[PDB]
């Protein structure tokens, strides 16, 4: 169990543009593209080819790699995130990276209270706090797996 496998599970794999739980055009392994033609356009530019709304597994895997790298890099460059990340064990690092991949750096950075509790190693409590969020109510099952990972420090939720 690693971040890649962890996210592959949470995001799935879809080779044709599609909308995500939020209405946004997305593709591959949770690769957020955006409206429609505009998204087919975003997609062709991202792949550098005329896609016709569809890509290979290999290209979806390329996006994925780019995406995970971008997230870790974004955490590390972020003032409020970095310190949290550094303070965590390797499993929980995975958990933060998941959230960032999903919701953007910016969005994670607003989980101010949870971020501080994670820092203080207040597990039970951060879990409770993370749950009061729109995030959890919109995608409760994913959210619970990620929250379990932060609570336990194990990969039990993904097995
Ligand atoms: Cl891209
Ligand atoms: Cl879900």
Q: How far is the CA of 102 from the centre of ligand 2 (A)?
A: 12
Catalytic residue numbers, as ranges: 11, 20
Q: Give the bridge partners for 117, in sequence order.
A: none
Numbers of helices and strands, H then E, in the chain: 9, 3
Length of the chain: 159
Short-list 144, 16, 135, 4, CA closest to 71: 4
Tokens of 40: 């087919």
Q: How far is the CA of 142 from the centre of ligand 2 (A)?
A: 4
Tokens of 115: 């971020």
Angle (CA) 25 104 116, round 5°: 150
Question: What are the backbone dihedrals phi and psi of residue 149, each rounded to the nearest 5 degrees, phi first?
Answer: -60, -35
Q: How determined?
A: X-ray
Q: How far is the CA of 3 from the centre of ligand 1 (A)?
A: 19
Binding-site annotation, residues for substrate: 32, 101, 114, 129
Determine the CATH number of domain 1-159.
1.10.530.40
| Resolution of the experimentally solved model in angstroms | 2.1
Count of CB atoms situated within 10 Å of the CB of 82: 13
DSSP 8-state code for residue 54 = B
Virtual torsion, Cα 115, 117, 119, 121, nearest 10 deg: -140
Alpha-carbon gap, residue 41 to 33, rounded angstroms? 9
Q: How far is the CA of 31 from the centre of ligand 1 (A)?
A: 8
Rg, the chain, Cα only: 16
Q: Do 10 and 98 contact (CB within 8 A), yes or no? A: yes
Q: Do 155 and 1 contact (CB within 8 A), yes or no? A: yes
Helix (H) or strand (E) holding 14: strand 14-19
Could you list which residues have their CB under 5 Å from ion ligand 1? 46
Question: What are the backbone dihedrals phi and psi of residue 139, each rounded to the nearest 5 degrees, phi first?
Answer: -135, 70
Count of CB atoms situated within 10 Å of the CB of 97: 21
Alpha-carbon gap, residue 91 to 78, rounded angstroms? 20
Question: What are the backbone dihedrals phi and psi of residue 106, each rounded to the nearest 5 degrees, phi first?
Answer: -60, -45
Tokens of 83: 């310190």
Alpha-carbon gap, residue 116 to 135, rounded angstroms? 18
DSSP 8-state code for residue 159 = -
Q: In terms of DSSP bridges, do strands 31-32 and 25-28 run parallel, antiparallel, or are they unpaired?
A: antiparallel
Q: Which ligand is nearest to the CA of 140?
A: 2
């Amino acid at each position: 169990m690693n971040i890649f496998e962890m996210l592959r599970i949470d995001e799935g794999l879809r080779l044709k543009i599609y909308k995500d739980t939020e209405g946004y055009y997305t593709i591959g392994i949770g690769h957020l593209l955006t409206a429609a033609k505009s998204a087919a356009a975003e997609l062709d530019k991202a792949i550098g080819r005329n896609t016709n709304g569809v890509i290979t597994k290999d290209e979806a895997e390329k996006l994925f790699n780019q995406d995970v790298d971008a997230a870790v890099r974004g955490i590390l460059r972020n003032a409020k995130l970095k310190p949290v990340y550094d303070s965590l064990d390797a499993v929980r690092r995975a958990a933060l990276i998941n959230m960032v991949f999903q919701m953007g750096e910016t969005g994670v950075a607003g989980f101010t209270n949870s971020l501080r509790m994670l820092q203080q190693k207040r597990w039970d409590e951060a879990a409770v706090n993370l749950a009061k969020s729109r995030w959890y109510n919109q995608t409760p099952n994913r959210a619970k797996r990620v929250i379990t990972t932060f609570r336990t420090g194990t990969w039990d939720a993904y097995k």
